[PDB]
Amino acid sequence: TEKRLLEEAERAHREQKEIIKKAQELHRRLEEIVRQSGSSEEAKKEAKKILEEIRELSKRSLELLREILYLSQEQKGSLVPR
Amino acid sequence: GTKEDILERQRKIIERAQEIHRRQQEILEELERIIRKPGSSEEAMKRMLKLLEESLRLLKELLELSEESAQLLYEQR
């Protein structure tokens, strides 16, 4: 069969790595916000936006993870829905 | 069989990673809840700072899990 199935899984992991990096940097910014100006309501608004962005990132990496399950474990199955 | 061991290894990592996602999102929402909750304080900020660390550490583990399975994919390519 096609080994590309696992090469595509590799790509997904590489994309997850970039997603994780971004998420960690967003958490770093949240730390800066909370530590410094966490009492500021406008800073809270910034933090909220960041938290929402992180949520998106976690969804993206989760969807990729479910794709990994298919490509890696059960590529002969039908785990498309994820 | 050794193929079954591989399948179980894949499940171990992937299933764990999915649980890590859950834990991260639970903390993520907790951070939001604290901010949106009225009557915030210095101790509330301390809570968030600790939560931020935890979620980062989870992201660290998550990355390592992805790297582990990524190397598996290479070897089994």
Tab-separated table of N, CA and C in Angstrom:
chain	number	residue	atom	x	y	z
A	1	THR	N	0.823	-1.203	0.000
A	1	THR	CA	0.000	0.000	0.000
A	1	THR	C	0.860	1.257	0.000
A	2	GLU	N	0.256	2.381	0.368
A	2	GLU	CA	0.924	3.674	0.285
A	2	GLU	C	1.443	4.115	1.648
A	3	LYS	N	2.760	4.251	1.758
A	3	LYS	CA	3.378	4.751	2.981
A	3	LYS	C	3.064	6.225	3.195
A	4	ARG	N	2.565	6.877	2.151
A	4	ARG	CA	2.215	8.290	2.224
A	4	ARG	C	1.199	8.549	3.330
A	5	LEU	N	0.407	7.532	3.647
A	5	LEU	CA	-0.598	7.642	4.700
A	5	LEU	C	0.031	8.072	6.018
A	6	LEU	N	1.240	7.585	6.279
A	6	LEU	CA	1.936	7.888	7.523
A	6	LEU	C	2.783	9.147	7.388
A	7	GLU	N	3.155	9.474	6.155
A	7	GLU	CA	3.819	10.740	5.867
A	7	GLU	C	2.871	11.916	6.055
A	8	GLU	N	1.606	11.712	5.701
A	8	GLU	CA	0.570	12.707	5.953
A	8	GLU	C	0.297	12.854	7.444
A	9	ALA	N	0.350	11.738	8.163
A	9	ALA	CA	0.247	11.757	9.617
A	9	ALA	C	1.404	12.527	10.240
A	10	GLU	N	2.601	12.326	9.699
A	10	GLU	CA	3.771	13.085	10.124
A	10	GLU	C	3.542	14.583	9.967
A	11	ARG	N	3.044	14.981	8.801
A	11	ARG	CA	2.724	16.381	8.542
A	11	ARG	C	1.779	16.934	9.601
A	12	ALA	N	0.744	16.165	9.922
A	12	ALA	CA	-0.241	16.581	10.914
A	12	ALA	C	0.414	16.839	12.266
A	13	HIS	N	1.336	15.961	12.647
A	13	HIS	CA	2.082	16.126	13.890
A	13	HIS	C	2.933	17.389	13.858
A	14	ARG	N	3.552	17.650	12.712
A	14	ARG	CA	4.352	18.856	12.531
A	14	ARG	C	3.493	20.110	12.637
A	15	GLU	N	2.273	20.030	12.116
A	15	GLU	CA	1.315	21.122	12.239
A	15	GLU	C	0.874	21.308	13.685
A	16	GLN	N	0.673	20.197	14.385
A	16	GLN	CA	0.340	20.235	15.804
A	16	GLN	C	1.449	20.896	16.612
A	17	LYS	N	2.694	20.575	16.273
A	17	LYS	CA	3.846	21.154	16.952
A	17	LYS	C	3.845	22.673	16.843
A	18	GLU	N	3.512	23.175	15.658
A	18	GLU	CA	3.406	24.612	15.437
A	18	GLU	C	2.228	25.201	16.202
A	19	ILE	N	1.119	24.469	16.228
A	19	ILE	CA	-0.052	24.877	16.994
A	19	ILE	C	0.265	24.962	18.481
A	20	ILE	N	0.952	23.947	18.993
A	20	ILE	CA	1.336	23.914	20.399
A	20	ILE	C	2.259	25.075	20.746
A	21	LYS	N	3.271	25.291	19.911
A	21	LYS	CA	4.168	26.428	20.072
A	21	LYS	C	3.388	27.728	20.224
A	22	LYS	N	2.460	27.966	19.303
A	22	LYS	CA	1.644	29.174	19.332
A	22	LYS	C	0.843	29.268	20.624
A	23	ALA	N	0.247	28.151	21.027
A	23	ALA	CA	-0.563	28.110	22.238
A	23	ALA	C	0.264	28.464	23.467
A	24	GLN	N	1.477	27.927	23.532
A	24	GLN	CA	2.376	28.198	24.646
A	24	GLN	C	2.750	29.673	24.706
A	25	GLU	N	2.960	30.273	23.539
A	25	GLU	CA	3.289	31.691	23.454
A	25	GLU	C	2.110	32.556	23.881
A	26	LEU	N	0.903	32.101	23.563
A	26	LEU	CA	-0.311	32.797	23.973
A	26	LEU	C	-0.515	32.709	25.480
A	27	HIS	N	-0.152	31.567	26.056
A	27	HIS	CA	-0.202	31.388	27.501
A	27	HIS	C	0.853	32.236	28.198
A	28	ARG	N	2.007	32.383	27.556
A	28	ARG	CA	3.047	33.279	28.044
A	28	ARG	C	2.550	34.717	28.114
A	29	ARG	N	1.837	35.141	27.076
A	29	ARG	CA	1.254	36.477	27.041
A	29	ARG	C	0.191	36.642	28.119
A	30	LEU	N	-0.615	35.604	28.313
A	30	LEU	CA	-1.617	35.597	29.372
A	30	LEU	C	-0.969	35.745	30.743
A	31	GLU	N	0.167	35.082	30.929
A	31	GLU	CA	0.945	35.223	32.155
A	31	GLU	C	1.380	36.668	32.366
A	32	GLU	N	1.885	37.290	31.306
A	32	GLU	CA	2.267	38.696	31.354
A	32	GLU	C	1.086	39.576	31.740
A	33	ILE	N	-0.068	39.305	31.142
A	33	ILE	CA	-1.273	40.080	31.412
A	33	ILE	C	-1.705	39.937	32.867
A	34	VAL	N	-1.887	38.696	33.305
A	34	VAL	CA	-2.399	38.424	34.643
A	34	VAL	C	-1.417	38.883	35.713
A	35	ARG	N	-0.141	38.577	35.508
A	35	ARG	CA	0.897	38.937	36.468
A	35	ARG	C	0.990	40.447	36.638
A	36	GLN	N	0.988	41.165	35.520
A	36	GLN	CA	1.196	42.608	35.536
A	36	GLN	C	-0.118	43.351	35.740
A	37	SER	N	-0.970	43.325	34.721
A	37	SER	CA	-2.157	44.172	34.693
A	37	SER	C	-3.431	43.336	34.688
A	38	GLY	N	-3.433	42.267	35.476
A	38	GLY	CA	-4.569	41.355	35.527
A	38	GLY	C	-5.790	42.028	36.142
A	39	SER	N	-5.556	43.123	36.858
A	39	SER	CA	-6.634	43.852	37.517
A	39	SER	C	-7.351	44.776	36.541
A	40	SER	N	-6.721	45.026	35.398
A	40	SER	CA	-7.285	45.915	34.390
A	40	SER	C	-8.365	45.212	33.578
A	41	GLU	N	-9.520	45.857	33.455
A	41	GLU	CA	-10.655	45.270	32.752
A	41	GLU	C	-10.394	45.193	31.253
A	42	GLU	N	-9.655	46.168	30.735
A	42	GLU	CA	-9.265	46.170	29.330
A	42	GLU	C	-8.236	45.085	29.044
A	43	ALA	N	-7.356	44.840	30.009
A	43	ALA	CA	-6.416	43.729	29.926
A	43	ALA	C	-7.140	42.390	29.967
A	44	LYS	N	-8.205	42.323	30.760
A	44	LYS	CA	-9.057	41.140	30.801
A	44	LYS	C	-9.675	40.861	29.437
A	45	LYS	N	-10.082	41.921	28.747
A	45	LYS	CA	-10.627	41.798	27.401
A	45	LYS	C	-9.602	41.203	26.444
A	46	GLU	N	-8.366	41.683	26.535
A	46	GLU	CA	-7.268	41.125	25.756
A	46	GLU	C	-7.064	39.649	26.071
A	47	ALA	N	-7.020	39.324	27.360
A	47	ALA	CA	-6.822	37.947	27.796
A	47	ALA	C	-7.926	37.038	27.268
A	48	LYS	N	-9.165	37.511	27.352
A	48	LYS	CA	-10.309	36.749	26.866
A	48	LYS	C	-10.154	36.401	25.391
A	49	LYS	N	-9.804	37.400	24.587
A	49	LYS	CA	-9.547	37.187	23.169
A	49	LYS	C	-8.493	36.109	22.955
A	50	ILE	N	-7.400	36.201	23.705
A	50	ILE	CA	-6.319	35.226	23.608
A	50	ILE	C	-6.806	33.828	23.966
A	51	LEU	N	-7.594	33.735	25.031
A	51	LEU	CA	-8.138	32.457	25.474
A	51	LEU	C	-8.994	31.817	24.387
A	52	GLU	N	-9.760	32.642	23.682
A	52	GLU	CA	-10.586	32.166	22.578
A	52	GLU	C	-9.728	31.662	21.426
A	53	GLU	N	-8.632	32.365	21.158
A	53	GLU	CA	-7.693	31.956	20.123
A	53	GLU	C	-7.051	30.616	20.459
A	54	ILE	N	-6.716	30.429	21.731
A	54	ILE	CA	-6.156	29.166	22.197
A	54	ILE	C	-7.154	28.026	22.035
A	55	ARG	N	-8.415	28.302	22.350
A	55	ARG	CA	-9.481	27.324	22.169
A	55	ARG	C	-9.532	26.824	20.732
A	56	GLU	N	-9.458	27.753	19.785
A	56	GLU	CA	-9.386	27.402	18.372
A	56	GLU	C	-8.203	26.484	18.091
A	57	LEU	N	-7.042	26.842	18.630
A	57	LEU	CA	-5.825	26.070	18.412
A	57	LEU	C	-5.975	24.648	18.939
A	58	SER	N	-6.604	24.515	20.101
A	58	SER	CA	-6.798	23.210	20.723
A	58	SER	C	-7.759	22.352	19.912
A	59	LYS	N	-8.717	23.000	19.257
A	59	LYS	CA	-9.625	22.312	18.349
A	59	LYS	C	-8.894	21.821	17.105
A	60	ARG	N	-8.029	22.671	16.560
A	60	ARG	CA	-7.271	22.329	15.363
A	60	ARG	C	-6.363	21.130	15.609
A	61	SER	N	-5.670	21.142	16.743
A	61	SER	CA	-4.742	20.071	17.084
A	61	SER	C	-5.487	18.798	17.466
A	62	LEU	N	-6.675	18.963	18.039
A	62	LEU	CA	-7.528	17.829	18.374
A	62	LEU	C	-8.036	17.133	17.118
A	63	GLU	N	-8.472	17.925	16.144
A	63	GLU	CA	-8.935	17.389	14.869
A	63	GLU	C	-7.819	16.646	14.146
A	64	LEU	N	-6.611	17.198	14.209
A	64	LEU	CA	-5.439	16.542	13.641
A	64	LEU	C	-5.133	15.237	14.364
A	65	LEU	N	-5.299	15.245	15.683
A	65	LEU	CA	-5.074	14.052	16.490
A	65	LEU	C	-5.997	12.917	16.066
A	66	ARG	N	-7.266	13.245	15.847
A	66	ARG	CA	-8.245	12.260	15.401
A	66	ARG	C	-7.926	11.761	13.997
A	67	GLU	N	-7.316	12.625	13.193
A	67	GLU	CA	-6.825	12.231	11.878
A	67	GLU	C	-5.639	11.281	11.995
A	68	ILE	N	-4.773	11.541	12.968
A	68	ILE	CA	-3.659	10.648	13.261
A	68	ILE	C	-4.150	9.246	13.597
A	69	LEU	N	-5.196	9.171	14.413
A	69	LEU	CA	-5.796	7.892	14.775
A	69	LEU	C	-6.128	7.069	13.537
A	70	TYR	N	-6.797	7.699	12.576
A	70	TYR	CA	-7.122	7.045	11.315
A	70	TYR	C	-5.860	6.650	10.558
A	71	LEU	N	-5.016	7.636	10.270
A	71	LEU	CA	-3.880	7.435	9.379
A	71	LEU	C	-2.886	6.442	9.969
A	72	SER	N	-2.725	6.487	11.287
A	72	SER	CA	-1.709	5.690	11.963
A	72	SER	C	-2.246	4.317	12.342
A	73	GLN	N	-3.328	4.303	13.115
A	73	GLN	CA	-3.811	3.075	13.734
A	73	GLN	C	-4.714	2.297	12.785
A	74	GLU	N	-5.759	2.957	12.296
A	74	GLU	CA	-6.809	2.281	11.545
A	74	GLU	C	-7.018	2.931	10.183
A	75	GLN	N	-5.957	2.974	9.385
A	75	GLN	CA	-6.022	3.569	8.055
A	75	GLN	C	-6.856	2.715	7.109
A	76	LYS	N	-7.107	1.473	7.508
A	76	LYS	CA	-7.948	0.572	6.728
A	76	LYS	C	-9.390	0.603	7.218
A	77	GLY	N	-9.673	1.506	8.150
A	77	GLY	CA	-11.021	1.657	8.686
A	77	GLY	C	-11.778	2.768	7.969
A	78	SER	N	-12.638	3.461	8.706
A	78	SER	CA	-13.460	4.521	8.132
A	78	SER	C	-13.602	5.692	9.096
A	79	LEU	N	-12.530	5.987	9.823
A	79	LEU	CA	-12.553	7.039	10.832
A	79	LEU	C	-12.371	8.413	10.199
A	80	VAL	N	-13.288	8.775	9.309
A	80	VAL	CA	-13.254	10.080	8.661
A	80	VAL	C	-13.976	11.129	9.497
A	81	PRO	N	-15.113	10.743	10.068
A	81	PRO	CA	-15.895	11.646	10.904
A	81	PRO	C	-15.051	12.223	12.033
A	82	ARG	N	-14.082	11.442	12.498
A	82	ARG	CA	-13.269	11.831	13.644
A	82	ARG	C	-14.101	11.878	14.919
B	1	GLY	N	0.857	-10.456	19.092
B	1	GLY	CA	1.765	-10.174	17.986
B	1	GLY	C	2.399	-8.796	18.133
B	2	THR	N	3.499	-8.578	17.420
B	2	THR	CA	4.228	-7.318	17.503
B	2	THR	C	3.451	-6.188	16.837
B	3	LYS	N	2.635	-6.541	15.850
B	3	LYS	CA	1.746	-5.577	15.210
B	3	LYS	C	0.693	-5.068	16.186
B	4	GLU	N	0.201	-5.961	17.037
B	4	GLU	CA	-0.752	-5.587	18.075
B	4	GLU	C	-0.111	-4.662	19.103
B	5	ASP	N	1.137	-4.952	19.455
B	5	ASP	CA	1.893	-4.102	20.367
B	5	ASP	C	2.040	-2.692	19.812
B	6	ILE	N	2.282	-2.597	18.508
B	6	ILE	CA	2.353	-1.307	17.834
B	6	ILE	C	1.022	-0.571	17.911
B	7	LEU	N	-0.063	-1.291	17.645
B	7	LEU	CA	-1.400	-0.711	17.693
B	7	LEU	C	-1.721	-0.186	19.087
B	8	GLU	N	-1.314	-0.937	20.105
B	8	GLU	CA	-1.540	-0.539	21.489
B	8	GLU	C	-0.669	0.651	21.869
B	9	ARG	N	0.550	0.678	21.343
B	9	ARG	CA	1.443	1.814	21.536
B	9	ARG	C	0.869	3.078	20.908
B	10	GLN	N	0.313	2.937	19.710
B	10	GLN	CA	-0.331	4.053	19.029
B	10	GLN	C	-1.531	4.562	19.817
B	11	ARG	N	-2.366	3.636	20.277
B	11	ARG	CA	-3.520	3.985	21.096
B	11	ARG	C	-3.095	4.700	22.372
B	12	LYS	N	-2.108	4.135	23.059
B	12	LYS	CA	-1.605	4.718	24.297
B	12	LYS	C	-1.293	6.199	24.121
B	13	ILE	N	-0.512	6.516	23.094
B	13	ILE	CA	-0.079	7.887	22.855
B	13	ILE	C	-1.249	8.770	22.441
B	14	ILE	N	-2.024	8.299	21.470
B	14	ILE	CA	-3.116	9.089	20.911
B	14	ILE	C	-4.211	9.321	21.943
B	15	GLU	N	-4.635	8.246	22.601
B	15	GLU	CA	-5.654	8.337	23.640
B	15	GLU	C	-5.222	9.279	24.756
B	16	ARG	N	-3.974	9.140	25.190
B	16	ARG	CA	-3.409	10.031	26.197
B	16	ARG	C	-3.438	11.480	25.727
B	17	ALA	N	-3.005	11.705	24.491
B	17	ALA	CA	-2.968	13.048	23.925
B	17	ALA	C	-4.356	13.676	23.903
B	18	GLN	N	-5.365	12.858	23.621
B	18	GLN	CA	-6.745	13.325	23.601
B	18	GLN	C	-7.213	13.723	24.995
B	19	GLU	N	-6.770	12.973	25.999
B	19	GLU	CA	-7.065	13.302	27.388
B	19	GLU	C	-6.355	14.580	27.815
B	20	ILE	N	-5.158	14.793	27.278
B	20	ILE	CA	-4.415	16.022	27.526
B	20	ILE	C	-5.140	17.231	26.948
B	21	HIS	N	-5.696	17.065	25.753
B	21	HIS	CA	-6.532	18.093	25.147
B	21	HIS	C	-7.682	18.483	26.069
B	22	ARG	N	-8.349	17.479	26.628
B	22	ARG	CA	-9.447	17.714	27.559
B	22	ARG	C	-8.987	18.533	28.758
B	23	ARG	N	-7.873	18.123	29.357
B	23	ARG	CA	-7.347	18.794	30.539
B	23	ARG	C	-6.965	20.235	30.230
B	24	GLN	N	-6.386	20.450	29.054
B	24	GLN	CA	-6.000	21.787	28.622
B	24	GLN	C	-7.219	22.687	28.464
B	25	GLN	N	-8.272	22.148	27.860
B	25	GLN	CA	-9.483	22.917	27.599
B	25	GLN	C	-10.236	23.215	28.889
B	26	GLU	N	-10.221	22.258	29.812
B	26	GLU	CA	-10.818	22.454	31.127
B	26	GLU	C	-10.151	23.605	31.870
B	27	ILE	N	-8.823	23.629	31.844
B	27	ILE	CA	-8.064	24.737	32.412
B	27	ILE	C	-8.317	26.027	31.643
B	28	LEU	N	-8.321	25.930	30.319
B	28	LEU	CA	-8.550	27.090	29.465
B	28	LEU	C	-9.854	27.791	29.826
B	29	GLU	N	-10.920	27.011	29.965
B	29	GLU	CA	-12.226	27.555	30.317
B	29	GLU	C	-12.224	28.124	31.730
B	30	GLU	N	-11.491	27.471	32.624
B	30	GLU	CA	-11.355	27.945	33.996
B	30	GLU	C	-10.723	29.331	34.041
B	31	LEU	N	-9.726	29.548	33.190
B	31	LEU	CA	-9.102	30.859	33.060
B	31	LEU	C	-10.119	31.914	32.644
B	32	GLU	N	-10.944	31.579	31.659
B	32	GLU	CA	-12.012	32.468	31.217
B	32	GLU	C	-13.007	32.735	32.339
B	33	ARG	N	-13.429	31.672	33.014
B	33	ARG	CA	-14.435	31.781	34.064
B	33	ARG	C	-13.976	32.723	35.170
B	34	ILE	N	-12.705	32.617	35.541
B	34	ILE	CA	-12.135	33.475	36.573
B	34	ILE	C	-12.170	34.940	36.154
B	35	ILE	N	-11.776	35.204	34.913
B	35	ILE	CA	-11.772	36.563	34.383
B	35	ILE	C	-13.181	37.141	34.339
B	36	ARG	N	-14.126	36.345	33.852
B	36	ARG	CA	-15.497	36.806	33.668
B	36	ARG	C	-16.229	36.903	35.001
B	37	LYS	N	-15.798	36.098	35.966
B	37	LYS	CA	-16.362	36.143	37.310
B	37	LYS	C	-16.081	37.482	37.980
B	38	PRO	N	-17.136	38.127	38.467
B	38	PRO	CA	-17.001	39.404	39.156
B	38	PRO	C	-16.416	39.220	40.551
B	39	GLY	N	-15.775	40.266	41.061
B	39	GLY	CA	-15.163	40.219	42.383
B	39	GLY	C	-13.800	39.539	42.336
B	40	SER	N	-13.013	39.873	41.319
B	40	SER	CA	-11.675	39.313	41.170
B	40	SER	C	-10.720	39.888	42.208
B	41	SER	N	-9.564	39.249	42.359
B	41	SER	CA	-8.609	39.627	43.394
B	41	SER	C	-7.196	39.195	43.024
B	42	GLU	N	-6.242	39.503	43.896
B	42	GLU	CA	-4.856	39.101	43.687
B	42	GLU	C	-4.708	37.586	43.731
B	43	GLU	N	-5.477	36.947	44.606
B	43	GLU	CA	-5.448	35.496	44.734
B	43	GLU	C	-6.056	34.821	43.511
B	44	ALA	N	-7.055	35.469	42.921
B	44	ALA	CA	-7.641	34.997	41.671
B	44	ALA	C	-6.621	35.024	40.540
B	45	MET	N	-5.802	36.069	40.514
B	45	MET	CA	-4.732	36.179	39.530
B	45	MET	C	-3.670	35.109	39.748
B	46	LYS	N	-3.356	34.844	41.011
B	46	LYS	CA	-2.443	33.764	41.363
B	46	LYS	C	-2.957	32.420	40.860
B	47	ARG	N	-4.259	32.199	41.005
B	47	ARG	CA	-4.890	30.983	40.508
B	47	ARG	C	-4.694	30.837	39.004
B	48	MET	N	-4.919	31.924	38.275
B	48	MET	CA	-4.788	31.914	36.823
B	48	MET	C	-3.346	31.659	36.402
B	49	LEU	N	-2.409	32.271	37.118
B	49	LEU	CA	-0.990	32.101	36.827
B	49	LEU	C	-0.565	30.648	36.985
B	50	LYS	N	-1.077	29.996	38.023
B	50	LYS	CA	-0.823	28.576	38.239
B	50	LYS	C	-1.470	27.730	37.151
B	51	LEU	N	-2.694	28.090	36.778
B	51	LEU	CA	-3.413	27.384	35.723
B	51	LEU	C	-2.688	27.503	34.389
B	52	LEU	N	-2.148	28.686	34.117
B	52	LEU	CA	-1.399	28.923	32.890
B	52	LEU	C	-0.169	28.026	32.814
B	53	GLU	N	0.533	27.897	33.934
B	53	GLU	CA	1.668	26.987	34.026
B	53	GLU	C	1.250	25.553	33.729
B	54	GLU	N	0.156	25.120	34.347
B	54	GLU	CA	-0.322	23.752	34.191
B	54	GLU	C	-0.638	23.441	32.734
B	55	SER	N	-1.339	24.359	32.077
B	55	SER	CA	-1.744	24.166	30.690
B	55	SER	C	-0.539	24.163	29.759
B	56	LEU	N	0.473	24.949	30.108
B	56	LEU	CA	1.733	24.947	29.375
B	56	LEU	C	2.443	23.605	29.503
B	57	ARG	N	2.495	23.083	30.724
B	57	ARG	CA	3.112	21.787	30.977
B	57	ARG	C	2.381	20.674	30.236
B	58	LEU	N	1.063	20.801	30.142
B	58	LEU	CA	0.257	19.868	29.361
B	58	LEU	C	0.598	19.953	27.879
B	59	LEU	N	0.800	21.172	27.392
B	59	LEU	CA	1.214	21.387	26.010
B	59	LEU	C	2.592	20.792	25.749
B	60	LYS	N	3.472	20.892	26.740
B	60	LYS	CA	4.782	20.257	26.668
B	60	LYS	C	4.653	18.746	26.507
B	61	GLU	N	3.883	18.126	27.394
B	61	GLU	CA	3.615	16.695	27.307
B	61	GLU	C	2.977	16.334	25.973
B	62	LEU	N	1.995	17.128	25.558
B	62	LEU	CA	1.298	16.892	24.299
B	62	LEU	C	2.271	16.867	23.127
B	63	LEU	N	3.150	17.861	23.074
B	63	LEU	CA	4.180	17.919	22.043
B	63	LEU	C	5.038	16.660	22.049
B	64	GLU	N	5.480	16.258	23.235
B	64	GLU	CA	6.321	15.076	23.379
B	64	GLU	C	5.602	13.825	22.893
B	65	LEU	N	4.308	13.740	23.186
B	65	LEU	CA	3.484	12.636	22.707
B	65	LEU	C	3.422	12.615	21.186
B	66	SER	N	3.237	13.788	20.590
B	66	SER	CA	3.193	13.911	19.138
B	66	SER	C	4.533	13.538	18.514
B	67	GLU	N	5.617	13.942	19.166
B	67	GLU	CA	6.958	13.631	18.689
B	67	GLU	C	7.234	12.135	18.756
B	68	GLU	N	6.788	11.504	19.838
B	68	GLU	CA	6.976	10.070	20.020
B	68	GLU	C	6.300	9.280	18.908
B	69	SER	N	5.043	9.612	18.632
B	69	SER	CA	4.276	8.921	17.603
B	69	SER	C	4.766	9.294	16.209
B	70	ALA	N	5.280	10.512	16.074
B	70	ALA	CA	5.861	10.962	14.815
B	70	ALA	C	7.061	10.108	14.425
B	71	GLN	N	7.894	9.783	15.409
B	71	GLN	CA	9.042	8.913	15.183
B	71	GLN	C	8.602	7.488	14.875
B	72	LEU	N	7.551	7.039	15.553
B	72	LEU	CA	6.919	5.765	15.232
B	72	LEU	C	6.507	5.709	13.766
B	73	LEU	N	5.851	6.765	13.299
B	73	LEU	CA	5.406	6.840	11.914
B	73	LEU	C	6.577	6.699	10.950
B	74	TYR	N	7.684	7.361	11.271
B	74	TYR	CA	8.901	7.251	10.476
B	74	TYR	C	9.386	5.808	10.407
B	75	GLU	N	9.509	5.175	11.569
B	75	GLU	CA	10.045	3.821	11.650
B	75	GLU	C	9.139	2.826	10.937
B	76	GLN	N	7.837	3.095	10.963
B	76	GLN	CA	6.856	2.192	10.374
B	76	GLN	C	6.482	2.629	8.964
B	77	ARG	N	7.111	3.702	8.496
B	77	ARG	CA	6.801	4.260	7.185
B	77	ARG	C	7.040	3.238	6.080
